[PDB]
């Protein structure tokens, strides 16, 4: 059809992939072995001819432990075995190991396996890349992969789903360095990237699901709910965001500023007692509540470059228009100067799906708002400050220089980040 | 990374190394025969890290003294060790670092490296080396450092971990020990990635003051060492709830290559279970440190804390946070989130709840100052210097090592006073 290949890099990226592909299977009625009782989800699944549906997906990690569980677990028959790729020793939370020393040992193998998936696409749109910012592999090998894919697939789009580190969810002291390094090397190679702040997901599981200490499974199933909201248009033949290129068109007027904020509603515990299903207006208003954002930042503070609303379920178009109209009269929505102020609307009419027996209640209508807002600069600034504190002492730098990286790449990355903060500042200065 | 290759050299090295295998064998359910008698698959999930499948410790026993191999071989767990793994001489080192590094040790070292090599080549993926030795004597100190440098030459990309016992006259009033330990510390700053500073001075003080032992023995001190080594290796040995090898640990613990000397601690100390506040308070208490340094005299660059036993994680996170919050002065503010907590649900033998502490603190300069002052006292009267130069050792190596250790001290001092 118009195929997208999903690539999952490092522990975070693999485990979020697991949740995402779990949910996709549920959404399309595909079983853990690829069976089910020209279909639109053929963008994300190949179809053999015996009725086996195979995810267009690659899993890569520089050590085998996480991917070994995929090869042994519930979905061991879902993916091609040659789709699941492991090395022997990981990047030790070290971008430079992931990008240079260890990553170069396996980059060509990864590209060969990607090439074989691509050769089974009639009209490949591009790639969705899932990875952590803090991991040595998630950061370092992702950057290497993104550079190589820009050369080998020059005209294909590449989108990122990346995990923003947070002290509340197993970060490490070097992660800020890794976040900046990957962001700098990837920036020119990614058309659009959706950041997930681990503290926001953590906050939401704690508040909305009453999970005091969210597990990765808790966090990743919520994450995959937002990811599914974002990729639904590619799997259900939408009217909005019908292909990867359209994400840039609809969300990214300025190529460097390509980090839209995802706000999702409603997140409701399956343990909550009976209650009336929330209306289109109610879930639309909730899109403007900071507590529902995927990245912690103050939107009241910023200005909008672009905004899409992706609805799922029992959603009547006139009710969306009335809800949006209400928002514009009641909320102070400011667009930056030279960007059209229309909200783009997508409606997927299929009921939103949850993992049976998970934490998330099944709802009659859900919405994911994607807003490219300058408020997300506050998240870059938080990262940059942590980087600055360590780097002013050159703390931990020697670990990177010893693994094939020149010390100048640290300041080169930081400078790029500083221009990115100024990009945000200048695009939204009154 | 999976497997770890363990080396124990010298008297001290082999006695603490033997105690280490007893504790962790008991923890993993490996009996004195090498037969598994444990009650949980958790005990076996990472047996591979320290054992080769019956389970045989991946340990190489080394001494230039013959009898210490006799004493371990008939020790409680002396039969688990591979016989071929015993590499010993007959001469001995005579508390002389230069005999261990340059003569008697140099003659035995290639034999050890052949055993190391065949243990390495059997490893799926080698995670690194760990060495138990004392720095105050001749074999563990001099030949241990020679081994360290040889391994670093043959395995440049592997982690070198060491548990090094620091001399104290409280325990061994032998006046050449500051010489041997300064020569060794010089080796350590250049060639190890991680060194746990096991300070005999602190061991004695803990036993004497805290444990109320009138005359602490090597068994009493080794009781604290073995419990410390079990605790710092807990995340290597038991299923996490943490996907990290020795390298990932070094990366996050060591902000500057030379500052890789850790102050280990343990709670509760022993020879009723504690609450989580108790555990946390004691774990940061000077009395619980295995290095004779007051942490309130310095600042923490990095801290790792490992809790063992069934306990409330929200209580732990809160305890750790308020300690950092209440005592922010003691924590370097230009390493965000430099206090990391991990938890393991399997407690050590004879305990429901424990906490192990790994601190990279600038207060450890007090340990090196102590040694340096004793080295300078001896060196300036030039006593016994000929024992060393007579083995071919250049005298300049003495002043070189002293300079390196004093550079270490000031390097801690500037990060102690660095602001952000």
């Amino acid at each position: 059809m118009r195929e997208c290949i999903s690539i999952h890099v490092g522990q975070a990226g693999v485990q979020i992939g697991n949740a995402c592909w779990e949910l996709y299977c549920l959404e399309h009625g595909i079983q853990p072995d690829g069976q089910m009782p020209d279909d639109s989800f053929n963008t994300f699944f190949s179809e053999t001819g015996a009725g086996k549906h195979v995810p267009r997906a690659v899993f890569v990690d520089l050590e085998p432990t996480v991917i070994d569980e995929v090869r042994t677990g519930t979905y061991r028959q879902l993916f091609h075995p040659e789709q699941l790729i492991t090395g022997k020793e990981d990047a030790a939370n070290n971008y430079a190991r992931g990008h240079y020393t260890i990553g170069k040992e396996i980059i060509d193998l990864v590209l060969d396996r990607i090439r074989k998936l691509a050769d089974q696409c009639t009209g490949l749109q591009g790639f969705l890349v899932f990875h952590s910012f803090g991991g040595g592999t998630g950061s370092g090998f992702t950057s290497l992969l993104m550079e190589r894919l820009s050369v080998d697939y020059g005209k294909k789009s590449k989108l990122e789903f990346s995990i923003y580190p947070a002290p509340q969810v197993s970060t490490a002291v070097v992660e800020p360095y890794n976040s900046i390094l990957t962001t700098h090397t990837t920036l020119e190679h990614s058309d659009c990237a959706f950041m997930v702040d681990n503290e926001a997901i953590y906050d939401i599981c704690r508040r909305n699901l009453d999970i005091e200490r969210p597990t990765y499974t808790n966090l990743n199933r919520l994450i995959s709910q937002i990811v599914s909201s974002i990729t639904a248009s590619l799997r259900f033949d939408g009217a909005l965001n019908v292909d990867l290129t359209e994400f840039q068109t609809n969300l990214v007027p300025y190529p460097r500023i390509h980090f839209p904020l995802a706000t999702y509603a409603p997140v409701i515990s399956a343990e909550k007692a009976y209650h009336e299903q929330l209306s289109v207006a109610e879930i639309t208003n909730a899109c403007f509540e900071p507590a529902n954002q995927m990245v912690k930042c103050d939107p009241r503070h910023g200005k909008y470059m672009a905004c899409c609303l992706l609805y799922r379920g029992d959603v009547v178009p006139k009710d969306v228009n009335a809800a949006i109209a209400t928002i514009k009269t009641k909320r102070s929505i400011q667009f930056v100067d030279w960007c059209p102020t229309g909200f783009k609307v997508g409606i997927n009419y299929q009921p939103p799906t949850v993992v049976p027996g998970g934490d998330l209640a099944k709802v009659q209508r859900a919405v994911c708002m994607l807003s490219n807002t300058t408020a997300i600069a506050e998240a870059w600034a938080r990262l940059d400050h942590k980087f600055d504190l360590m780097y002013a002492k050159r703390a931990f730098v020697h670990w990177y220089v010893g693994e094939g990286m020149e010390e100048g790449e640290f300041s080169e990355a930081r400078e790029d980040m500083a221009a990115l903060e100024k990009d945000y500042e200048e695009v939204g200065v009154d | 990374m999976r497997e770890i290759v363990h080396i124990q050299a010298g008297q001290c090295g082999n006695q603490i190394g033997a105690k280490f295998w007893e504790v962790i064998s008991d923890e993993h359910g490996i009996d004195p025969t090498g037969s598994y008698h444990g009650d949980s698959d958790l005990q076996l999930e990472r047996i591979n890290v320290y054992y080769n499948a019956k389970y045989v410790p991946r340990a190489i026993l080394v001494d230039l003294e013959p009898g210490t191999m006799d004493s371990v071989r008939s020790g409680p767990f002396g039969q688990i060790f591979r016989p071929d793994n015993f590499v010993f001489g007959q001469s001995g080192a005579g508390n002389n670092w230069a005999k261990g590094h340059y003569t008697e040790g140099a003659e035995l070292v290639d034999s050890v490296l052949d055993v190391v090599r065949k243990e390495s080549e059997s490893c799926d993926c080698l995670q690194g080396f760990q060495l138990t030795h004392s720095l105050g004597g001749g074999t563990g100190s001099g030949m241990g450092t020679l081994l360290i440098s040889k391994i670093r030459e043959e395995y440049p990309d592997r982690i070198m971990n060491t548990f090094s016992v620091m001399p104290s006259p409280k325990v061994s009033d032998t006046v050449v020990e500051p010489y041997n330990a300064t020569l060794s510390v010089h080796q350590l700053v250049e060639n190890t990635d991680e060194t746990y500073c096991i300070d005999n001075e602190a061991l004695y003080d803990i036993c004497f003051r805290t444990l109320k032992l009138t005359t602490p023995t090597y068994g009493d001190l080794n009781h604290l060492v073995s419990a410390t080594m079990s605790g710092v290796t807990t995340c290597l040995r038991f299923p996490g709830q943490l996907n990290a090898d020795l390298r990932k640990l070094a990366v996050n613990m060591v902000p500057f290559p030379r500052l890789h000397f850790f102050m280990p601690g343990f709670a509760p100390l022993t020879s009723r279970a504690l609450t989580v506040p108790e555990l946390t308070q004691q774990m940061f208490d000077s009395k619980n440190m295995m290095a004779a340094c007051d942490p309130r005299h310095g600042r923490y660059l990095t801290v790792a804390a490992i809790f063992r036993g069934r306990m409330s994680m929200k209580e732990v996170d809160e305890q750790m946070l308020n300690v950092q919050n209440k005592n922010s002065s003691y924590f370097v503010e230009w390493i965000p989130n430099n206090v990391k907590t991990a938890v393991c649900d399997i407690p050590p033998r004879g305990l429901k709840m424990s906490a192990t502490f790994i601190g990279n603190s600038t207060a450890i300069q007090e340990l090196f100052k102590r040694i340096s002052e004793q080295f300078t006292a001896m060196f300036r009267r030039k006593a016994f210097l000929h024992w060393y130069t007579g083995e071919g050792m250049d005298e300049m190596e003495f002043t070189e090592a002293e300079s390196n250790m004093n550079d270490l001290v000031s390097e801690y001092q500037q990060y102690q006073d660095a602001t952000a």
């Binding site: 020697h398 220089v401 | 250049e190 071919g392 190596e397 070189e400």
Partner: peptide, 13 residues
């Protein structure tokens, strides 16, 4: 006997 120099291990990084 040749001996180890200060900073000689710093070269690895």
């Amino acid at each position: 006997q040749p001996f180890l120099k200060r900073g000689e291990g710093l070269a690895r990084f």
